[PDB]
Design a binder for this molecule. Structure first.
Ligand SMILES: CCCNc1ncnc2c1ncn2[C@@H]1O[C@H](/C=C/CNC(=O)c2cc(-c3ccc(F)cc3)cc(O)c2O)[C@H](C)[C@H]1O
Ligand SMILES: [Cl-]
Ligand SMILES: [Cl-]
Ligand SMILES: [Mg+2]
Length: 213
């Protein structure tokens, strides 16, 4: 029996179905009082919320769902008709994420795809009828942020103005991605200093807006 399952169970035992805020609060409580987990957390989550509200994206892609905390956070702020696609390679996590979103009442706004980003990304246009993405949240293995950003561009999924938002650019860090976007004339970057989830350790988010080829 796993930490991720215990988080889901705590949410089901404690939170209110159909109430996304209650779900986020239950997770944050569990992870503060019982067992730490790598959810984006409330400190960085508040920055995410502010970014999402500012840009009002119609189509968001998330890479790495884990237990669905960030999916709940984002989906709850989407305008009617806007959608989130989230990719999660681990089948157990994909199931936890789906159940988390079901419990929150957000399942109508989110599609959880169980597979590898590098396999699914090239299918988005043909199989999922995507044109371009308005926002991308990166929170999967940190060494895959750069390879997947480059793949998104190759597949024609980025447009002028697409907002990339990357977790953990300080800890654990994503040094190739961060150096790449900050050095590239095709991205305009902003750093949001914050704290590692549930810890008094500095971390941050990077926002990188695609400028076109
Ligand atoms: C190759 C397949 C790629 N394609 C993929 N396609 C689809 N899904 C993918 C792909 N690659 C991975 N995933 C999924 O994303 C998730 C993985 C997320 C990884 N996140 C961290 O490692 C982290 C660590 C810390 C941390 C900080 C301080 C510490 F002391 C300890 C830990 C903090 C944080 O906020 C962190 O997000 C999920 C578990 C995993 O199955
Ligand atoms: Cl998360
Ligand atoms: Cl936090
Ligand atoms: Mg993270």
């Amino acid at each position: 029996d796993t930490k991720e399952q215990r988080i889901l169970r705590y949410v089901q035992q404690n939170a209110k179905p159909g109430d996304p805020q209650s779900v986020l609060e239950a997770i944050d409580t569990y992870c503060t009082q019982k067992e730490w987990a790598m959810n984006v957390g409330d400190a960085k989550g508040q920055i995410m919320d502010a970014v999402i509200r500012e840009y009002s994206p119609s189509l968001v892609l998330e890479l790495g769902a884990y237990c669905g905390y960030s999916a709940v956070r984002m989906a709850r702020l989407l305008q009617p008709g806007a959608r989130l696609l989230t990719m999660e390679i681990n089948p157990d996590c994909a199931a936890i994420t789906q159940q988390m979103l079901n419990f929150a009442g957000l399942q109508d706004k989110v599609t959880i795809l169980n597979g590898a980003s590098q396999d699914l990304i090239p299918q988005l246009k043909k199989k999922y009828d995507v044109d371009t993405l308005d926002m991308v949240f990166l929170d999967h293995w940190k060494d895959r942020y750069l390879p997947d950003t480059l793949l998104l561009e190759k597949c024609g999924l980025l447009r002028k103005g697409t907002v990339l938002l990357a977790d953990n650019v300080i800890v654990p860090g994503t040094p190739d991605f961060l150096a790449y976007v900050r050095g590239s004339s095709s991205f305009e970057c902003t750093h949001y200093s914050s704290y590692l989830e549930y810890m008094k350790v500095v971390d941050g988010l990077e926002k990188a807006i695609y400028q076109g080829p």
